[PDB]
Scaffold this active site. Structure first.
Site, short mmCIF file in Angstrom:
data_model
loop_
_atom_site.label_atom_id
_atom_site.label_comp_id
_atom_site.label_asym_id
_atom_site.label_seq_id
_atom_site.Cartn_x
_atom_site.Cartn_y
_atom_site.Cartn_z
N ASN A 190 37.80 35.62 42.32
CA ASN A 190 38.56 34.47 42.84
C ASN A 190 39.43 34.83 44.06
O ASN A 190 40.26 34.03 44.48
CB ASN A 190 39.47 33.86 41.75
N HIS A 192 41.84 37.02 44.30
CA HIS A 192 43.22 37.35 43.97
C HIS A 192 43.31 38.85 43.68
O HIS A 192 42.32 39.44 43.24
CB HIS A 192 43.70 36.54 42.75
N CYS A 227 50.94 39.30 44.70
CA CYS A 227 50.88 39.82 46.06
C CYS A 227 49.63 39.17 46.65
O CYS A 227 48.55 39.19 46.04
CB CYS A 227 50.78 41.35 46.06
#
Ligand SMILES: Nc1cnc2ccccc2c1
Ligand SMILES: Nc1cnc2ccccc2c1
Ligand SMILES: Nc1cnc2ccccc2c1
Ligand SMILES: Nc1cnc2ccccc2c1
Lengths: 268, 269
Positions: A190, A192, A227
């Site tokens: 995804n 991330h 982050c």
């Protein structure tokens, strides 16, 4: 792997790979954390949940709701050597409206002894607004049939290392690793940053001599903020003492907190 | 896995893990490169060589001699999805006194079709002085009994992509990723930067748009120098071209000392 006889937990066996070991010829805590994530995914797939790391139901998908890790706690007694087979058993448990808990037990396949154990706290949030929601009545009834009804804790000890509050590190930090950026190998499907990357970033500020003379026994990590792909991180560490440390991950610019944690190390 | 019936090659099956896939729900080239490294290590163990990544004999260990990758070439036709079983067959071949070659064939376990192939050139060097040397007869005779006697090439083609010279990128580079450092997860058991990390660093300078609309088909990488634990790297890329080709350069962010050079070929999804 496979769900156990009662269908309330999942088991999987892993052989430790050549690229998965550290300087002492045994698996790293990042290798362990990756295997827990993998066995958690296979458990979610074996009972019909999503497999993108969010373990969502059709109801959760319609409302743009996902499960996010708030805390990870890992205790390792023996790191498996490469070629060794490690068996991990995992299960979920409801924690009322607060969220969900996933626990793990690591064992030696040959001796059957417990070589490690982990616990994690998950909260429900909107994927878009990044908010935080109480586990609604409708969503909990969909996952409760896959959880043991009686409490089943990897860390049963009445008030232990996984339920203590982590304080915020004060400047100046004793040690630090500055300018840490994620690469494409640190991102998931995804896009991330993978949760294991933060564990690696926390450990980047531990001095080399500790890594050379000690073995990591316990790690407790709080996930306050994610982050982004284009963010830069600073890793801070101070000795609070065995050797104990307080950790802090924060954005290189504004100093916005992303993670806080503690580690305990044992002399080899 | 296990050595085949003739004991001249090794086979192993891998299930693709959840953390081993990219944005397309398929294994990344770094996951593939890690699996080739793993199957190469298991082949070396199954016949008595060292397993630290150097595949040494007692003669080589006595002389402080190791095997180091000089070039890696990978061509992927289909990246396996997570949960899919991929079967990799690997073998070694002597290339005279120049060094050795390790080849790989990747297959789909269910269909049996070839979904990828790789080849690599290894040179012998002194661990300490970092000086290359031509393979002696005593060293050659110790590993030849584990290699096929007739040539067995993963890339047999008359004039193939794995034997072409890679030119040096000229400044200014079209794209770049600056200030890249290895972390403890990028180091191997001997505290050296893993060879797969350099592949990742090369791909860091490929623009996001290419990653989003194309799939990596071919990658050829030259290993000129090792990046130390405390070194910082700059990754440079320039388009050299339905297909997209790039020239790559890894160099130390300080002095601009070359560590790697390579080429990639991408095809539209
Ligand atoms: N004793 C250990 C185990 N795993 C680690 C993983 C990353 C960095 C340091 C580590 C030290
Ligand atoms: N709340 C959840 C999420 N995922 C699960 C996966 C497997 C078993 C129980 C679960 C409970
Ligand atoms: N199509 C691909 C495959 N693997 C990759 C690995 C690292 C970075 C980019 C990639 C793109
Ligand atoms: N030069 C070498 C090194 N390692 C090997 C491992 C297995 C078979 C053949 C080999 C040849």
């Amino acid at each position: 792997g496979s769900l156990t006889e009662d269908g309330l937990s999942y088991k999987e066996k892993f052989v430790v790979r050549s690229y998965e070991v550290g300087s002492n010829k045994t698996a790293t805590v990042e290798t362990i954390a990756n295997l827990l994530q993998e066995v958690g995914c296979n458990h979610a797939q074996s009972v019909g949940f999503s497999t993108d790391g969010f373990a969502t139901t059709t109801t959760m998908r319609k409302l743009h709701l996902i499960w996010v890790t708030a805390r990870m706690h890992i205790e390792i007694y023996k790191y498996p050597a490469w070629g060794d087979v490690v068996e991990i058993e995992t299960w979920c448990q409801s924690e009322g409206r607060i969220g969900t808990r996933r626990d793990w037990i690591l064992k030696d396949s040959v001796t059957g002894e417990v070589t490690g154990r982990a616990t994690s706290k998950w909260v429900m949030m909107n994927q878009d607004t990044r908010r935080l929601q109480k586990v609604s009545d409708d969503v909990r009834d969909e996952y409760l049939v896959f959880c043991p009804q009686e409490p089943r804790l990897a860390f049963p000890e009445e008030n232990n290392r996984s339920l203590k509050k982590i304080p915020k590190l004060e400047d100046p930090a004793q040690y630090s690793m500055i300018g840490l950026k994620p690469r494409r190998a640190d991102l998931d499907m995804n896009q991330h940053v993978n949760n294991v990357t933060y564990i690696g970033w926390v450990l980047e500020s531990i001095p080399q001599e500790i890594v050379d003379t000690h073995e990591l026994q316990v790690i407790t990590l709080d996930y306050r903020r994610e982050c982004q792909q284009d963010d830069v991180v600073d890793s801070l560490t101070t000795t609070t003492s065995d050797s104990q440390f307080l950790h802090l991950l924060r954005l290189s610019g504004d100093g916005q907190e992303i993670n806080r944690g503690t580690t305990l190390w044992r002399k080899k």
